Amino acid sequence: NNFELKLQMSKVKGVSLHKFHLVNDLRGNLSVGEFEKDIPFTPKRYFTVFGVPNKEVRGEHAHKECKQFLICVSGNCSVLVDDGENREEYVLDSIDKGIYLPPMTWGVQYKYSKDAVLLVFASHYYDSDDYIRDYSTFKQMRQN
Amino acid sequence: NNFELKLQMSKVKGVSLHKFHLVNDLRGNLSVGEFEKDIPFTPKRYFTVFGVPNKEVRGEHAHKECKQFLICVSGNCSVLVDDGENREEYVLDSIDKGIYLPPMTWGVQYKYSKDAVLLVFASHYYDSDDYIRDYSTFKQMR
Ligand SMILES: Cc1cn([C@H]2C[C@H](O)[C@@H](COP(=O)(O)OP(=O)(O)O[C@H]3O[C@H](C)[C@@H](NC=O)[C@H](O)[C@H]3O)O2)c(=O)[nH]c1=O
Ligand SMILES: Cc1cn([C@H]2C[C@H](O)[C@@H](COP(=O)(O)OP(=O)(O)O[C@H]3O[C@H](C)[C@@H](NC=O)[C@H](O)[C@H]3O)O2)c(=O)[nH]c1=O
Ligand SMILES: [Cl-]
Ligand SMILES: [Cl-]
């Protein structure tokens, strides 16, 4: 359903779901994305989450300025995105599926498979002060 | 012991081997790098190579302008790099290992494991004319 087109918008504010160009041939397989085109920003940072125990739960934050883009490059994991009003779960289970999380998207990442690797591109360098880490505070900042 | 340190320079001109900041906790591992810091350029493109048959040999050419940065995020592969005078092989077998290929590095990726997934950051959008395919030309240029 959710990642069938190259680009589709979530009900969750600003969140976009992406299907990256894929070449399958005799010699192997290749998926590709272009920054400022398929991923709607230029990254200053990347990180990878891996080796997550069975049923462990990560995230429970929103970012005030940092844009993020998530691709599960091995295995599978599930993501909940929440704009304060609307929330949805998406399953990142193939290398050509990506999800854009604009700033002020409360996100959780969970149900990682044993060999799952989540890749994240980030618009901003790492800054611990960019995080909102409790949900009620996030809700106040989302109010109209 | 090639990726022992945060940073080490290959004998192959301008090639650098990288070990990324890694934080483990009870919920697993996070490794991170920053563009124009640990990785010496900002990408315009990324690509992933996967499901490569074990006998395949990929590359055998160089780029005129495109900078690349390679991390094997799952499984293992080997990389051969050549500046025209020196050649070396490095094994990308862990997610916190990376290698920088500056322009005019004649490169090969091979010995992919069944489960290998190679992630590449590129400084330029895909360009079919960015390739140097004749080794003699490549050496002359260097
Ligand atoms: C992203 C980062 C962390 N650390 C350090 C901070 C923590 O000590 C450790 C784990 O971070 P944390 O507990 O936030 O891991 P998680 O709960 O997995 O959250 C991480 O991944 C999420 C997908 C992101 N988005 C929404 O939740 C988060 O921005 C990202 O942090 O890595 C960096 O040093 N440098 C860094 O660039
Ligand atoms: C990298 C790319 C290819 N294609 C298309 C062009 C080719 O038809 C096919 C695979 O390319 P190719 O035969 O070069 O795969 P390889 O032989 O694996 O070489 C690729 O990976 C290497 C790390 C790089 N350098 C190697 O020393 C190369 O830049 C990169 O091309 O995918 C993109 O559309 N968009 C793209 O971004
Ligand atoms: Cl889904
Ligand atoms: Cl090595």
Ligand code: NA
């Ligand atoms: Na609260």
